[PDB]
């Protein structure tokens, strides 16, 4: 029954409309959902706008009138210039008249701000179309009408606010460059009159709602108006005093003054400098007397969240940081301005204590700006000595966990603050530590915070001072551990002790005996069952090693052998209680140390000793696994194998090229294992179906395959001897993985294969052209068929696929030349297919492959393959690129689309395509590709965008083609085109903007 309004043959029943609307907004459930779909269908009607006058007149429902304006808005924005000229005038006068009537009724003006604001925005859309060329008297008449009524005046400020927004703040990529400039100049030319009205309202008072609306419009003006309107008038005085007293105007005023601080201003005028100081002085004055004193607890105030206090304190922070980041130098010389400077910063200290993450980040960015300046600028730091001292405590007390962005920001400020006064920093931290011991500030969180802070400033003190400091801290922490009872409390402190020492490698390096004791203690903690301790022990171990590895590989004076040997001897005992992941980290850390041994014979010996356990386990497996291939069904054997390989990955990760001897030890048997595991997976899928891939059995088997691929990939990506890679590793690898991948069903294919191959082609692709051909043959077509039915299925294969094609196109383009014509055609289809992805991992590679492909073809010069490529695929790439450029569903790839298109168009206008791109039938013999390109494109756009005039298309292409050497301008023209296709009757002269 509600679907009656969708019948335009009959007169629209306003009563029925309001019922549908109410059912949607105030209703619920199915009735609401049904009304929703009815309303959408209504406003989507391209003739609904005609029945807008009815609604706005005869309706009593504000939401219905709102929807009516939305329908009108859509018309004005897209089809305005298509209407008969009479309709344009009619709609205009109807909107003006409607606004005037709503303003004259105090009841309506008071209770329907939403409908009025919408009507105003709708008026602004008309202005963007009609003003000033067909409405020169708008601003004069606006100013005139303002003097008669307060309500009308206030509403005009809303219209001018919205107008300023649409022209200056949101015009980019909503209107053409030409249209934007036109409207900007128009507003600029008549602003003198607007400002006069604005200033009179502000100075003469006195309606709160009128003042606020005026100030809100002023905020928008300040984004673009010349500085003279602010400094050559008394307006700064009004903002910084009068309007800071009343809370109604205080919020908006503070936002205005923030933007005033960002105005473009000459830096040589001494009078302007005083004006800039003055309004700051006045503002801080009003805050101290009307809002709160400098001593006030803003943390508590913000927490209470009374009224608009949180927004105000946010705005105050933005104001202070903005002004001071730019102008604090104005306050640093004059002794009469010192109190002001420090009060402003004292407010910032208090703000910095507020518990609010995003606010803290705002103030912290300012503090960074300050202390960095004090670090470099002569004769400044003494001014802020008391501010900096407070700041040290504030930052130390709010230090966050390092794991990260906020921590690094905090670290930088605190390091600066430590340089500025090492003595005060040390004192605060020791004092803080004392209050952890007496229990006055003791907590798990508080001791962790202090530890992170103490750890963050390592390498800032002198070595001697650092040594004294570190020792004092560890002693105090050690005593704190003994004090506590229960493993929980003792565990927190013990972990913090290990954290701090791990952060002071310079100290550890200088004191071997202590370093040894630390490592030995970590080894003890690797047996601790208490939750988190083992993870902590391993993470600290590798962290210390990364920084102190040299002290593990050499013989210390009081030692018989390098400590790395001692670690390896007891490695089974040390790691006996660790989880597999933790063991791998341990082995990885050992690999870091071994890599520092530059004696090859010694390095390889250490490597062999380290890998003793996994190699023995490995040898035992290879024997048992091959004799009885059924062993691999055992989940325990599969897990053992996976962990052995993972251990090799871990060590290979830290040793890179040095890992080769260990790789050669297992390589051939590993690939044999790869084959055996592959057979079982296939056998399992055959016996149980695709569901088998989901079972723990097969997932365990595929893990072995994936880890093997990862190990080979890891080594090859870091290999220095590429001759050995090519002549020993590649051929067995390809024989082991390619056919298996090709001949498995889609759900059993490992995307890791593609990834591994990408690395192979990357590092040695230039040396194995036959190898690359074999890779394409085995993975190209069968992978493409997996991903070319939709954009969702096989996401990993999707990404790795185009990464592989990309590197092949870069390193071994010959491989594509050897493809049969039918396969090269699929290659092109695959690239365009990548364009249409929203998935940026695919889209970006797709566009890059396209770009690099064109370049590869270009370098071939005038040869048959290059000529046939252009004949076959040039206009395919031009049109496909144009499609994603204009379909509004690939805006993320605009820049690379533009670059590709520009490159394609440039080929023709530089005459780099030797052969004609046309048939001798469709075009007279002798026609340049340049002329034919224009015809093809003109025709293509005409059919794709039939609502465009031939003149638009001609002007667009004329501009586009002659700008194909300048990318920024080229892109501008494309964006102008994307605006014009969204409406009817776009001006073709817009494309002459550059």
């Amino acid at each position: 029954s509600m679907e009656g309004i969708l019948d335009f043959s009959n007169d629209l029943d306003i009563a029925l409309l309001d019922q549908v609307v109410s059912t949607f907004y105030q209703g619920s459930g199915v009735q609401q959902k049904q009304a929703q779909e009815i309303l959408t269908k209504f406003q989507d009607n391209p003739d609904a706008w005609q029945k807008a006058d009815q609604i706005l007149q005869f309706s009593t429902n504000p939401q219905s009138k709102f929807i009516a304006l939305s329908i009108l808005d859509k018309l004005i924005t897209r089809k305005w210039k298509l209407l008969p000229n009479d309709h344009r005038i009619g709609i205009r006068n109807f909107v003006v008249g409607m606004i005037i009537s709503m303003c004259q009724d105090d009841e309506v003006f008071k209770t329907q701000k939403n409908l009025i604001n919408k009507s105003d925005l709708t008026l602004v859309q008309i202005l963007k179309q009609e003003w000033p060329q067909n409405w020169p008297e708008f601003i004069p008449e606006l100013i005139g009408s303002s003097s008669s009524s307060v309500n009308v005046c206030e509403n005009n400020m809303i219209v001018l606010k919205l107008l300023s927004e649409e022209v200056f703040d949101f015009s980019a990529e909503q209107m053409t460059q030409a249209k934007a400039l036109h409207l900007k100049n128009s507003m600029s030319k008549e602003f003198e009159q607007i400002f006069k009205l604005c200033f009179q309202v502000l100075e003469q008072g006195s309606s709160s709602s009128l003042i606020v609306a005026t100030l809100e419009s002023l905020l928008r003006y300040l984004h673009w108006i010349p500085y003279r309107y602010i400094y050559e008038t008394n307006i700064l005085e009004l903002l910084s005093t009068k309007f800071m007293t009343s809370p109604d105007t205080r919020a908006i005023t503070l936002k205005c003054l923030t933007e005033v601080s960002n105005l473009k201003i000459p830096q040589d005028n001494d009078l302007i400098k005083r004006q800039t100081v003055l309004f700051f002085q006045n503002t801080l004055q009003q805050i101290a007397t009307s809002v709160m004193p400098v001593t006030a607890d803003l943390k508590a105030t913000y927490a209470n969240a009374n009224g608009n206090d949180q927004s105000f304190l946010q705005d105050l922070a933005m104001f202070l940081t903005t002004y001071l980041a730019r102008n604090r130098a104005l306050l640093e010389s004059d002794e009469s301005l010192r109190e002001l400077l420090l009060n402003a910063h004292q407010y910032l200290i208090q703000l910095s204590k507020i518990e609010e993450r995003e606010l803290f980040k705002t103030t912290l960015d300012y503090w960074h700006n300050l202390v960095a300046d004090l670090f470099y600028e002569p004769l400044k730091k003494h001014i802020y000595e008391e501010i900096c001292s407070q700041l040290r405590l504030v930052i130390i007390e709010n230090m966050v966990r390092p794991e990260i962005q906020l921590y690094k920001s905090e670290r930088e400020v605190l390091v600066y603050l430590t340089h500025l006064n090492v003595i005060d920093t040390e004192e605060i931290m020791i004092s803080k530590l004392a209050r952890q011991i007496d229990g006055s500030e003791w907590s798990w969180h508080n001791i962790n915070t202090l530890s992170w802070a103490i750890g963050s400033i390592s390498g800032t003190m002198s070595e001697d001072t650092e040594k004294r400091f570190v020792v004092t801290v560890i002693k105090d922490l050690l005593g704190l551990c003994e004090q506590k009872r229960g493993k929980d409390n003792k565990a927190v402190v013990a972990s913090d002790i290990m954290y701090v020492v791990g952060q002071y490698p310079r100290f550890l390096k200088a004191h071997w005996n202590f370093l040894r004791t630390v490592i030995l203690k970590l080894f003890e903690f690797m047996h601790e069952t208490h939750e988190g301790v083992q993870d902590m022990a391993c993470d600290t171990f590798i962290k210390i090693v990364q920084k102190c590895k040299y002290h593990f590989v050499i013989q210390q004076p009081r030692e018989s052998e390098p400590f790395i040997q001692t670690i390896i001897r007891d490695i089974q005992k040390t790691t006996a209680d660790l989880q597999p992941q933790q063991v791998h980290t341990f082995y990885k850390a050992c690999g870091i140390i071994i890599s520092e041994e530059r004696s090859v014979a010694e390095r390889n010996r250490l490597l062999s000793d380290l890998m003793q356990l996994p190699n023995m386990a490995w040898d035992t497996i290879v024997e048992q696994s091959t004799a009885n291939p059924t062993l691999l069904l055992d989940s325990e054997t599969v897990k053992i194998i996976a962990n052995i390989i993972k251990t090799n990955v871990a060590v290979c990760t830290s040793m890179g090229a040095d890992f080769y001897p260990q790789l050669g030890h297992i390589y051939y048997n590993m690939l044999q294992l790869y084959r055996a595991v592959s057979s079982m997976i296939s056998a399992q899928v055959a016996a149980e179906g695709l569901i088998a891939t989901k079972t723990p059995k097969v997932r365990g088997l595929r893990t072995i395959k994936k880890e093997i691929l990862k190990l080979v990939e890891t080594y090859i990506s870091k290999a220095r001897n590429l001759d050995d890679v090519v002549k020993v590793l590649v051929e067995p690898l390809l024989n082991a993985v390619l056919e298996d991948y090709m001949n498995n069903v889609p759900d059993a294919r490992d995307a890791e294969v593609l990834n591994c191959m990408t690395t192979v082609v990357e590092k040695v692709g230039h040396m194995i052209p036959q190898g690359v051909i074999l890779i394409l043959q085995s993975v190209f077509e069968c992978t493409l068929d997996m991903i070319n039915k939709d954009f969702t299925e096989y996401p990993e294969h999707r990404v790795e696929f185009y990464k592989l094609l990309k590197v092949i196109n870069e390193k071994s383009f010959a491989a594509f030349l050897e493809l049969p014509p039918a396969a090269f055609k699929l290659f092109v289809d695959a690239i365009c297919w990548a364009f249409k992805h929203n998935n940026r991992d695919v889209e970006v590679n797709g566009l890059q492959i396209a770009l690099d492909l064109v370049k590869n073809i270009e370098r071939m010069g005038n040869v048959p393959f290059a000529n046939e490529f252009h004949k076959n695929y040039f206009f395919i790439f031009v049109s496909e690129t144009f499609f994603v450029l204009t379909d509004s569903d690939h805006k993320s790839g605009f820049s690379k689309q533009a670059l590709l298109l520009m490159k394609l168009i440039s080929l023709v206008y530089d005459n780099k395509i030797s052969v004609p791109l046309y048939q001798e039938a469709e075009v007279p013999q002798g026609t340049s590709n340049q002329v034919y390109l224009s015809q093809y494109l003109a025709n293509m756009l005409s059919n794709a965008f039939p609502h465009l005039t031939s003149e638009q298309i001609a002007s667009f292409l004329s501009a586009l083609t002659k700008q194909c050497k300048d990318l920024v301008v080229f892109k501008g023209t494309l964006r102008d085109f994307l605006v014009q296709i969204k409406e009817v009757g776009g001006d073709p002269t817009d494309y002459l903007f550059a």
Partner: peptide
């Protein structure tokens, strides 16, 4: 969680 070894190493400097 005793760490007598740590103190001894610290007192050794």
């Amino acid at each position: 969680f005793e760490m007598t070894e740590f103190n001894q190493a610290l007192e050794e400097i």
